Design an enzyme around this catalytic site. Structure first.
Site, PDB file in Angstrom:
ATOM      1  N   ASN A   4       0.342  -3.234 -10.657  1.00  0.00           N
ATOM      2  CA  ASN A   4      -0.955  -3.192 -11.358  1.00  0.00           C
ATOM      3  C   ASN A   4      -2.050  -2.686 -10.418  1.00  0.00           C
ATOM      4  O   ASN A   4      -1.923  -1.571  -9.894  1.00  0.00           O
ATOM      5  CB  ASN A   4      -1.350  -4.546 -12.034  1.00  0.00           C
ATOM      6  CG  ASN A   4      -1.135  -5.811 -11.247  1.00  0.00           C
ATOM      7  OD1 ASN A   4      -1.796  -5.999 -10.234  1.00  0.00           O
ATOM      8  ND2 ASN A   4      -0.238  -6.709 -11.697  1.00  0.00           N
ATOM      9  N   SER A   5      -3.080  -3.463 -10.180  1.00  0.00           N
ATOM     10  CA  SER A   5      -4.169  -2.894  -9.353  1.00  0.00           C
ATOM     11  C   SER A   5      -3.739  -2.682  -7.939  1.00  0.00           C
ATOM     12  O   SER A   5      -4.348  -1.905  -7.178  1.00  0.00           O
ATOM     13  CB  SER A   5      -5.361  -3.778  -9.338  1.00  0.00           C
ATOM     14  OG  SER A   5      -5.906  -3.745 -10.636  1.00  0.00           O
ATOM     15  N   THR A   6      -2.696  -3.170  -7.136  1.00  0.00           N
ATOM     16  CA  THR A   6      -2.484  -2.760  -5.754  1.00  0.00           C
ATOM     17  C   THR A   6      -2.228  -1.281  -5.754  1.00  0.00           C
ATOM     18  O   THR A   6      -2.441  -0.685  -4.740  1.00  0.00           O
ATOM     19  CB  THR A   6      -1.391  -3.549  -5.210  1.00  0.00           C
ATOM     20  OG1 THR A   6      -0.216  -3.252  -5.994  1.00  0.00           O
ATOM     21  CG2 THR A   6      -1.730  -5.058  -5.380  1.00  0.00           C
ATOM     22  N   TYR A   7      -1.852  -0.665  -6.905  1.00  0.00           N
ATOM     23  CA  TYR A   7      -1.559   0.776  -6.878  1.00  0.00           C
ATOM     24  C   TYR A   7      -2.839   1.633  -6.639  1.00  0.00           C
ATOM     25  O   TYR A   7      -2.757   2.808  -6.215  1.00  0.00           O
ATOM     26  CB  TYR A   7      -0.839   1.229  -8.148  1.00  0.00           C
ATOM     27  CG  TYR A   7      -0.307   2.635  -8.063  1.00  0.00           C
ATOM     28  CD1 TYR A   7       0.730   2.967  -7.156  1.00  0.00           C
ATOM     29  CD2 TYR A   7      -0.800   3.641  -8.915  1.00  0.00           C
ATOM     30  CE1 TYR A   7       1.271   4.258  -7.120  1.00  0.00           C
ATOM     31  CE2 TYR A   7      -0.268   4.934  -8.886  1.00  0.00           C
ATOM     32  CZ  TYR A   7       0.751   5.235  -8.004  1.00  0.00           C
ATOM     33  OH  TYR A   7       1.256   6.520  -8.062  1.00  0.00           O
ATOM     34  N   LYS A   8      -4.006   0.997  -6.762  1.00  0.00           N
ATOM     35  CA  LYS A   8      -5.270   1.705  -6.478  1.00  0.00           C
ATOM     36  C   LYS A   8      -5.326   2.110  -5.030  1.00  0.00           C
ATOM     37  O   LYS A   8      -6.010   3.057  -4.675  1.00  0.00           O
ATOM     38  CB  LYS A   8      -6.499   0.847  -6.886  1.00  0.00           C
ATOM     39  CG  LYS A   8      -6.437   0.496  -8.370  1.00  0.00           C
ATOM     40  CD  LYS A   8      -7.558  -0.512  -8.747  1.00  0.00           C
ATOM     41  CE  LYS A   8      -7.651  -0.657 -10.260  1.00  0.00           C
ATOM     42  NZ  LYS A   8      -8.822  -1.592 -10.457  1.00  0.00           N
TER      43      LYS A   8
END
Ligand code: CAZ
Ligand code: CAZ
Lengths: 247, 244
Positions: free
Chosen positions: A53-57
Site C-alpha cells: 500500500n503506501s510504502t510503495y510511495k
C-alpha cells in the site's frame, strides 16, 4: 500466491519481540550495514507477501525522480480542487508534504506518467516481491503487487546502498522526504502504510532506516492482525529499536 | 552598535533566569505574527564579530558563485593535522557546517573577490559591513554584527533576493539540528577565544513548527560565552516561549 523463498547468505539473529507486539500479529526485520547481519522476529511470517500500500510511495518517489517527473527545483503538484477526506490533502503539494502526509493523489499522479515497461524493468532489477503489476492501475493498493517484510528491508537497502543507476541527488531528495526524527544520537527515516478492507485495518507497515553515530540500520515492521495500522507499526518499530539500543 | 529603529511590533522579554551565570541577549522573530521578541535590548544592539555564524553566509556565497554545488559540495582534506578529529577528513557542506570545519569555509572565502562580498554585505545590511584587510575578516576581526541584526539579516536573506531557492534549500539542509513531530530546529553555533578566554558566543537559526516559522539568535558576552552554551540557552528559551 507464493511467498518469499530466497535464502539469506548472512549472519542472522532470531529475535523474540512478542511482548512489544502484544495482541498485534506480524513481524520485524532489521539489517545492520556494519555487521552485514539480519535480525528477525517471526522469520516465517517475515517472508509472507502482502500489498505494500503506501510504502510503495518510496518507489513511486524514486521513479518520479529518476524519470524527472519531479526534481529538486520543482516537485510541486497542483491540487485539482476535489474534496479529499483529509484536510492535508486538500492543497498544493511538494514531495516533502506529500510523503509526510501520505497524500495518495500526488503519488497516483506520478504513477500515471510512468510507462509500464519502465516499472517492470525496475521491479525486476530491484527484485520487488512478486513483481506483479496486474492491470497497472493503483496496483500497489491492496491489489496485484505484493512484497514480504523481509524483502521490504532487502529491497530498500539495495536501492539506496548499491552502486546503481539512481543518482546521488535523487537518493538525497528521497531521503530528505523520508526523515522523521533527527537528534544528537540518530536520524530516523521511514514510511507508514495502512490498508482497510471491510471497515477493518488489515495490513500495516512501517519501512525505514536509522543512521546512528556507529552504524546504519534498515528495518521494517508489518502488522496483519490486532490493530494493524501504519501508526501502530511505527510505534512498535520505535519501541523495538529503542529496546535493542539502536535509538 | 546598531542604531536603526525597529519598524515592527515587539515584545520585551526578561529571560534573565535562563541566562543565569551567563550574560548577553536573545532575539526572536515570528513570520506569522510579524513580531520581534527581545531579551536585553541594549546588548542586542551591540555589534560583535560573527565568527563561525558567518559560515552561513560563506556557504550562500559559495553556492551563488558555484564554488560549491548541488551535485558536489565535497572538498578533500590536505592532510594537515587539525586539533579537532572531525576536521581531519574529507568534507561536504553538511559535515563542514555540523562540525564547524574552519578550513572548508576559509577555502570558499579565498575564491571570492572583495567586490562581490562588499555588494552582498551592502544588499544584506550586514552589521558594520567592515571587510578590513579582507583576510579572515569574520574571525574576531573587522566585521561586526549585533544579535538583533543576526535575526533581521538572516530572515531577510532567506525570506525576501538574487539567491536561488535551490541554494537556500541546500544551505537549510546543512543547518538542520533537530527534527521531531512538533518542529524542525536549524542553526549554527559560533565561539570566539581571545587572551585564552571564551569571549563571544552565538547560536543563530530558525525553527519551523506546524504553525509558524521563527528566526532567532542568542549572543553571549559573559560567564561561559561559548556557542555550546548559546545553543543550550536558546533551546531553553524557545521551550519556554512555546515554539517547541
Ligand atoms: C497508504 O497506505 C494509504 N492508505 C490508504 O489509502 C488506505 N486506507 O487508508 C484510509 C484512508 C484510512 C481509508 O480508510 O481509506 C487503503 C489503501 S488500499 C486499502 N484497502 N486501503 C494512506 N496511508 C496512510 C499511512 O499509514 O501512511 C493512511 C493512514 C491512510 S492514507
Ligand atoms: C567558529 O566560531 C569557530 N571558532 C573558532 O575558530 C575560534 N575559537 O575556537 C576555539 C576552539 C575556542 C579555539 O581555541 O581556537 C576563534 C575564531 S577567531 C577567534 N579569536 N577564535 C569554530 N566554531 C565553534 C562553534 O561554536 O561551532 C567552535 C567551538 C570552535 S571552531
Amino acid at each position: 500466491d507464493y511467498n518469499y523463498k530466497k535464502p539469506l547468505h548472512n549472519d542472522y539473529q532470531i529475535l523474540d519481540k512478542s511482548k512489544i507486539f502484544g495482541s498485534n500479529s506480524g513481524s520485524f526485520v532489521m539489517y545492520s550495514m556494519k555487521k552485514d547481519k539480519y535480525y528477525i522476529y517471526n522469520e516465517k511470517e517475515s517472508r509472507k507477501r502482502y500489498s505494500p500500500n503506501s510504502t510503495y510511495k518510496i518507489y513511486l518517489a524514486m521513479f518520479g525522480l529518476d524519470r524527472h517527473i519531479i526534481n529538486d527545483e520543482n516537485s510541486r503538484m497542483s491540487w485539482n480542487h476535489k474534496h479529499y477526506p483529509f484536510d492535508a490533502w486538500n492543497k498544493e503539494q511538494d514531495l516533502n508534504t506529500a510523503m509526510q502526509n501520505s497524500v495518495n493523489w500526488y503519488f497516483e499522479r506520478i504513477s500515471d506518467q510512468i510507462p509500464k515497461n519502465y516499472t517492470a524493468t525496475q521491479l525486476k532489477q530491484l527484485n520487488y516481491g512478486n513483481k506483479n503489476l496486474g492491470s497497472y492501475k493503483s496496483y500497489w493498493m491492496e491489489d496485484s503487487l505484493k512484497i514480504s517484510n523481509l524483502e521490504q528491508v532487502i529491497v530498500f537497502k539495495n536501492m539506496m546502498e548499491q552502486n546503481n543507476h539512481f543518482s546521488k541527488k535523487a537518493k538525497n531528495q528521497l531521503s530528505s522526504s523520508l526523515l522523521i526524527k533527527k537528534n544528537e544520537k540518530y536520524e530516523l527515516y521511514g514510511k507508514t502504510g495502512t490498508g482497510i478492507v471491510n471497515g477493518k485495518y488489515n495490513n500495516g507497515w512501517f519501512v525505514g532506516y536509522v543512521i546512528t553515530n556507529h552504524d546504519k540500520y534498515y528495518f521494517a515492521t508489518h502488522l496483519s492482525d490486532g490493530k494493524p495500522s501504519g501508526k501502530n507499526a511505527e510505534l512498535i518499530s520505535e519501541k523495538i529499536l529503542k529496546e535493542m539500543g539502536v535509538l
